[PDB]
Symmetry: C6
Subunit: 318 residues, 6 copies
């Protein structure tokens, strides 16, 4: 509903990229569950623990029952097949979940949710005030009721300023979240690229069970290897875009030095020099709202100015 203005474009993009990652994860998961197959055969002639690979033709006879193939299938799936091809989608699901948690933690966390809902309530009831457009147009009789409403609103804004000025928690939380995203990004890229090549269609496996079948080695096929490879490539691509976005966010924030809102633009333009600069934890919100729309900041700044209140006193006193 109302927190769309808080979320910037980068957070919006992350929100949908997470859905796409989760989608491919769920699909790979159900695809793994429904088949989870390998197709294994023996190898009669062995050379260095591998196949030699050396009147019409006739089929070869191995003298095996259907149920022994499934046993050797399960064994060569358990032991010699590599864990990544098994557990790829579960990991992706876990990662997407903890991304989303790192994103929405500071919304769900009450200490900050209270400050944010109070801030936005103040901002909207200020923007919807009637006296603002008049004050901006001035660069003369008004209703006593809305005059008193504005008068109480000034005091509310002052108390809110005094309350928010102390905290400085939101900056720290958002900082920690971005850093967690970036380090986790790097970590997943590392082992994903390192272990992607091990997915293969064909596998030789020597499991050492003579007594049950009488064959040493086996050659096996994993049909889903190609598809999981495609999904992994698409995955790491989306991940790359996500991490570049997070790096841009981090650079923006650390560069701006944004604990202090400079504010000088409006006071020179609108000729209200008697406005102080803002302190920590109330400037960050203004920067966020500025990324959405600069208009809200200007509409809110008028109540902060004491000159506006001094003028409003004249209209109530009349």
């Amino acid at each position: 509903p109302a927190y769309r203005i808080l979320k910037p474009w980068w957070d919006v993009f992350t929100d949908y990229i997470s859905i796409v990652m989760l989608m491919i994860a769920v699909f790979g998961g159900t695809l793994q569950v429904t088949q989870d197959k390998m197709i294994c055969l023996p190898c009669k002639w062995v050379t260095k623990d591998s196949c030699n690979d050396s009147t019409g033709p006739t089929g070869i006879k191995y003298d095996l029952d259907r149920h022994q193939y499934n046993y050797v299938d399960a064994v060569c799936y358990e032991n010699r097949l590599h864990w990544f091809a098994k557990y790829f989608p579960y990991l992706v699901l876990l990662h997407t979940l903890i991304f989303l948690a790192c994103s929405n933690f500071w919304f769900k966390f009450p200490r900050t949710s209270s400050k944010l809902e109070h801030f936005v309530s103040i901002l909207l009831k200020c923007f919807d005030s009637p006296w603002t457009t008049r004050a901006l147009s001035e660069t003369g009789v008004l209703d006593k009721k809305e005059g008193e409403q504005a008068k109480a609103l000034f005091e509310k804004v002052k108390k809110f300023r005094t309350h928010v000025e102390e905290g400085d928690i939101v900056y720290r939380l958002y900082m920690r979240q971005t850093i967690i995203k970036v380090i986790k990004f790097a970590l997943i890229i590392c082992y994903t690229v390192y272990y992607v090549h091990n997915i293969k269609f064909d596998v030789d496996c020597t499991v050492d069970i003579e007594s049950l079948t009488g064959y040493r080695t086996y050659r096996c096929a994993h049909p889903l290897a190609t598809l999981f490879k495609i999904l992994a490539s698409f995955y790491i691509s989306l991940v790359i875009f996500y991490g570049l976005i997070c790096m841009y966010t981090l650079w923006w924030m650390l560069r701006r030095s944004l604990k202090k809102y400079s504010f000088e633009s409006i006071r020179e333009e609108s000729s209200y020099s008697d406005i102080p600069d803002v302190k920590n934890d109330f400037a960050f919100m203004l920067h966020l709202i500025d990324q959405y729309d600069p208009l809200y900041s200007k509409r809110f700044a008028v109540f902060l100015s004491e000159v506006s209140e001094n003028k409003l006193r004249q209209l109530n006193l009349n």
Copy 2:
């Protein structure tokens, strides 16, 4: 809810065509997943890497187990079968998603969403104003309250004009989106038509595994080839309609030269010559609203006229 007036008929048609494309994609996808079968047999007599195709009859005996057929099935599915027949529906899903993204990007993007929600809020509160129908009927006592509401509304419209006049971002974004749609259209038509013919029911494949079975070549059948061919034909047809719609949109926009709203019709008809012409990024919106219903433009234009304000001053002063 309220953005239905912004969307023109072509965007409406695209919205439903995307749903149809997504529907056939999901269906082909689940159909591929649940079977993903081929039925492969050997070929005893070979001529040029192909079958010679040369007391009651008797069945032929190949001396193969059930589990070897599945191995050769997986192999001839992996190697010699063509990637398009495998991965047709996934590509279609991807394309539909990126179409929808290109369509709804300028709605979800905050810099423009703010301008649009502000514009439409202004337009609706102007259309719902009581003084408009009276002003149009004039071609005399009014309430001081609604008079002051209108008076503030003029100032709001002026500030909004000054704000929107600068940007010119919406035109660029919509331009880029249409062009992306058209080039992506052409690209998908190209390889889709080039590779559709390779889907076939029957396939000969030579995989070179003598040691496991003792047969060189194999003849295989893919039942879903016909159905995927039908779906691909239906797909490219829908795509053609989509691209022709996009071309019409592009021609309309580039032809109209619409940064400047000509406006001359109302001023001659309603005898309000003292209205300036509109500049970039506020005309495009008027053209869009004109495609929906011309009435909103006329109802909104009265507040822009200074003569209307001059007359309204007389009614408030009385």
Copy 3:
């Protein structure tokens, strides 16, 4: 919500018949997907490309593997089985979708949706007016506020009349939609009845593959033939009802000659002779609302009369 009054009983019936058709389509579709089986056997003795059909008994031995039966199954399913039994439900789904599109096109189309939402808004705010019941009861002090509301409402109705009088698009669209429904009805009845008989339980098929099996001909069974026959009969029955409804609609509209709303009933009854007749594109709406409830037309007609306005002037002037 509010467009229920626009929809007549025939459109209501079509709306639910489409749901039933879609239901049987989805069911036949999933039933086709989950089995898609035939059961094929060879035929040892052949006479004219067909079976001769000529110490306890003993089973017959064909010397075939399980995997060859599936191959010949796929072949005799692809080639000699008839396309209608395969693709019956998909066609039904397509038809139902394009029926629904032809039904809801003039609602979703913005040029007409604007006129309709404006019309119905006017009608409801007129019906909810307090002065109407008094004016009808007359066959005396009123509030100045509601008097001015009614006075502005007369002007709104006049502007709306002048706006709607020109168009004549809604009649053309509804005409085209009904005709599309009727011609498509006839087309589907034609080939459905012509090709329904080809569905059969038992099929003889000669596919000409000696090298793979050594048998010429095959006898095959399709279990779902009976069920699809039942569904097709039920389908064509529902379709017949739909088409008869559409024919009734078409006859009604072409017979009534409804561009001109005759209107003579109320003016003779309520003694308001000074009301003009209505022109194109505003009469069609009145006929539709008359099919729902004649009361709305009478309650709306009073504002159109100039005598009512002349009398209302006396009450405001007092």
Copy 4:
């Protein structure tokens, strides 16, 4: 929402019984689809087209492949198995749907829906009127506004009476619906009880195919016979309850002779003798509302009385 008062207890019970019938239908349907099995075997020794039923033991050898059993399965399922055991749940679904249609037709039908929504709107705005409780308490200064509201309400009720008095359609529709329910009830009981006994676990079938297998007769088993028998018993029981309810409804309506609302109770009790009796199509509604709660009828009857209006004139005139 508001039509709960219209629905009597019998219609409420029918509404839930239909859901239960639909539930068992859907369950039997999916159960039929997922198995649809029979298990068929041959019979070596035949006596009168039936089985004679005449060193450790040894298994019997029939020399049949797995794929021939499925063929004879499909054949003996198609031909000799009885259609009721196949198509039981589909019929039940159809019946439940047409029951629900017969129930909700007069709600969905616009000609009557308009009358009903208008009636209930009048009744609720009368019940919520403030003057009613005072008038009942009388067995003295009031607000001019609510006085005028009541005064207009009398005229609205009079116009509504004149409008509704003519129709007499609702009685005919409800009559037809009840009769359709009762005759359809009897019909389904008839063939359901006549054909339930044919469901059996074991079946002998002689299909006459020597050339494909060399056996004349077959003995087959249908596992779901018992379960479908249980569901059919439960079905006919629920149906019996439904039909007895419908018979009670029919007897009630035909006995009461309810076109004329007798009304004599309130006029003797509350001493308002000057109220006429009610005519057709406005009494039926009062009887329905009486079945829910008699209070609404009494609260509504006061406005119908002319004495109440005569007294209200004194309070407005003061």
Copy 5:
């Protein structure tokens, strides 16, 4: 929404226990449907219609086809397996449904739903009245409007008292429902505990079919026996808790003798001795609301007192 105050804690617990019972029923149902397996083998040596149970080892050869095992499976499943293991979850579902029906019958039943919605509407509009807190604080100028509202509210409460005093239906219905719950509880415990032990993993069955196979007896296994046993134990435990709750409810109601609300506490405390005792069918509601929160009863009792009305007359007369 508003009936949460009517429901006591025991009804709340029953509501969730029914959901848990339904959950285990649905799970056991789908588990039964998807497998419904037994695994049957013959027994070569027989002693008293049972198995005697008496160079490497070698497998035993019975000379049976795959399709005969399924036949004997179906037979030994139909005949000798016990009906409880088959139809356990369906019964549980039926019981849960009829529990829920017995719980919500007096809400859905209109004759009582009208009384309850009217009662609660009165109670809430009384609790939200402004004069109540003042009257309680008294142990002096008020608005004429709210004074008249309260004055009409007294009359409404009096009429409602006279209406509700007669009925005494709600007590009878709730009594019948509790008793049905208790007797049905006892019945299900009886046969559930009596027949639970018959579920077993291993079963010997003698079906008497020599001609089809040549074996007399069979030994069979039912894998789901253990799981259904666990579910049945959990089921009867939940059922026990449910029945003990119902017994507590029954004892409470029969002990309290609650047709007469004693009421003596408030009149001694708040010094309003001039309040009569309450009669049947209006006391039961007060007891229910007392179980939720005693405050509503006290806030409502003030309007019942005539002294409160006598005092309120002085404030309106001033």
Copy 6:
């Protein structure tokens, strides 16, 4: 909706951890249901009830049918496989459910839900009062209406204080719930860690059935052992976090000694020394609201002060 302020951060974390636990439970459950497989083979040479594990190679022949493998599979699954590997996910589901019950019991329980909804209603209508910000700003003409509203609000707060002061039930319930969570935590950790190691891939089982097959021992494989081991590790980790959170909660509550709200901070700061200390069952709520946001406590405390009421008397009297 409104109870988000009551829930602290620890309860929030528990709420989502329960969803994750339930998710892994449902997944392990469906995974168990769909396969529930073991793959068992015999062992020809036995040494101490275990396998000795001692011209191309040839397959071994056991002379067993497909249906005997399934029998021995079911037997070795029933008897020698350990119950934990079977019933792991059901237990997890049960635990998660009873965690959620212990969490939401005091919300669903009516005796406390009434007190809480009344408390929060009072708090919100106090926070939304206009006089509070003025009273805080004072560290002078007001509307008589809101003055009387505040005056009644003081009395409401006093009655509410007297009502809540007695109970002391909420503290006991929350205490019991935390303790149940901690003891159940310890219990599940105990047997989970004790029995996790018994899950294994390979199992030897001696079932003692010579007559049916002629083999003593069997070697079996359980593919899902690894996956269930991973899920169990992840489970116990989440559980550990949950229990540490619960221990922190318990330590906080027992340490604070919170029946008495110390309150001294505001009276020294805002110079309102004439406020008493709070008693049991009204302090706990204040501590909870303090964990969310301290501002509500301060905004509410002003009405509790008698000095504020004494000052408000002057403004109403004027």
